[PDB]
Write a protein that binds this ligand. Sequence first.
Ligand SMILES: OC[C@H]1O[C@@H](O[C@H]2[C@H](O)[C@@H](O)[C@H](O[C@H]3[C@H](O)[C@@H](O)[C@H](O[C@H]4[C@H](O)[C@@H](O)[C@@H](O)O[C@@H]4CO)O[C@@H]3CO)O[C@@H]2CO)[C@H](O)[C@@H](O)[C@@H]1O
Ligand SMILES: [Ca+2]
Ligand SMILES: [Ca+2]
Length: 602
Amino acid sequence: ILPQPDVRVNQVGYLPEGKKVATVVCNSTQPVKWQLKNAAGVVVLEGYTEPKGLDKDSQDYVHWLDFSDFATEGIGYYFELPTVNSPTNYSHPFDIRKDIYTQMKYDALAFFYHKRSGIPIEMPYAGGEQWTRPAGHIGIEPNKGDTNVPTWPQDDEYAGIPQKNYTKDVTGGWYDAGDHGKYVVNGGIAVWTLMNMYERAKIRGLDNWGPYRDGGMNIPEQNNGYPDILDEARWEIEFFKKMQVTEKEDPSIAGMVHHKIHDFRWTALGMLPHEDPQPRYLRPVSTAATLNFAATLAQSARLWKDYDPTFAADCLEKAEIAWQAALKHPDIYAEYTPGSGGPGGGPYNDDYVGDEFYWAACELYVTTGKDEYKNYLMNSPHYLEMPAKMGGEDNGLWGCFTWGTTQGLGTITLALVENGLPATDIQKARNNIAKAADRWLENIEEQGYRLPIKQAEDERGGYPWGSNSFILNQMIVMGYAYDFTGDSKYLDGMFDGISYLLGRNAMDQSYVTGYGERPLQNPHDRFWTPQTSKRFPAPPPGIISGGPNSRFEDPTINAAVKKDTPPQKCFIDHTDSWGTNQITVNWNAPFAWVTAYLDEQY
Ligand SMILES: OC[C@H]1O[C@@H](O[C@H]2[C@H](O)[C@@H](O)[C@H](O[C@H]3[C@H](O)[C@@H](O)[C@H](O[C@H]4[C@H](O)[C@@H](O)[C@@H](O)O[C@@H]4CO)O[C@@H]3CO)O[C@@H]2CO)[C@H](O)[C@@H](O)[C@@H]1O
Ligand SMILES: [Ca+2]
Ligand SMILES: [Ca+2]
């Protein structure tokens, strides 16, 4: 077992240039001496600590150890505190080189090939023989799904609103997380995040770099003429298309998009996609899913126009058919359902879709330039909006957006792409984004472990489900700020956010698989779960954990830690802790956006 260094640092390392502040565990409030040592032991730098006191989220007495000035490349740098009488008066070995996120950006996007449904996971692409597996859900027993998935049984206690009895082929798409579900909601932001990082590379001019080019990713679409990152994105878009309801299926709601499709009931950990024996069904349909659809398909329409005109055009034509249907049924909300004992997939419920509408409008406007999308876009409560603090479940949480609080996603599209909105408004939008980043930049300075989020305002406070993802989305908006201003403070903010995710935290935990001295090793996943049975393999690298969640929303974290544990410590790296150690598409997408960004800024 690993001791836990008194000096918390990024367990992998730092880019030679930029803000660098470790966090020490020192009740000894009074500047204590430190000293950066190279692998050999020689003190290549030194100074004193900065007493910050009792940190509210971690219940730790801490000091900051700013060493931003230092920028000398090398392997094995480890801090120390000669005066301190602690058996752990130090930091894990780390690096200061240019290629910290060079490989990590690919690993992160590889997560999406791995979670692909309806296709075999084969060698080269898998990165290892042990991650190979049969296609998941292609109608071959024991699977009972996706080629002919019927609508949810009506007599079911959680059947949701009534549906007609029919079947669809909804093969393909990505698995959401540790489960075998496929959700349009949550899938929407995930896929928007990959296409957006691409569009950003294009407009800036580096779309001919890394994963943005044909042959940039170790996926089967390596040299098919299209940009690799979009091939992945299209995999999910192809699945969205199949989820849209047709005239022959149900006239009352044609053009609308089924909320999600998954197992009738929950299966246990320790299973591969093709082994899932559960009956498979289609959830009801929801304005939000219809709008995520309209939005990502519009975005897809303008990005694929140069490569595959036929595909790009059908995307747009479907996006509009969905936007239109959403106006006629603007208030069908996916309702809540238990997390255990009920439907075999998460609910992703939301009773507010104004933002979604705003989002779809922003994407449709920039793509079609039509008046109707412009009039909505502008006369909206969310016009040019960009939260720093949201506010159903997201109210008072801290962060710019989530799978359910979508305004902001659209706003980013307005602040980065063509469109003929008064150049004046575009300016506000870009300012709001920088404002938003400033607030978070503050949170970091008042935070002991320099993380951009503070506990929730929802009175219960603490860190929410998948907190880490909030830090991630924040880093994206920050990233744009450094684009619109050039003020390296926004970049240093990112440097703090990611440092937290990689080890400078109250758990001395690297929430990313395959990275750090204490890497994330037991995510809640049905395939990569060594703890369930040695039969299954440790997971691939570059996948991030949801992190701390002080709502004790799973048995394991309930039995593993006291009832009063500090929010930033409410975590356990155990495959059973689904509320604290799970992996998803809406978390690895933003984690990828961010790792890519940090690799270019270098
Ligand atoms: O508060 C809502 C929260 O949802 C987050 O998304 C969740 C998604 O909604 C949920 O479907 C899934 O978490 C699943 C987990 O994958 C699944 O394996 C597990 O199933 C258990 C079962 O409950 C047990 O009874 C027993 O049978 O074992 C199985 C397998 O271990 O159930 C959980 C949910 O109950 O993952 C998504 C990602 O976290 C949103 O991200 C968040 O923002 C929302 O607040
Ligand atoms: Ca390609
Ligand atoms: Ca919403």
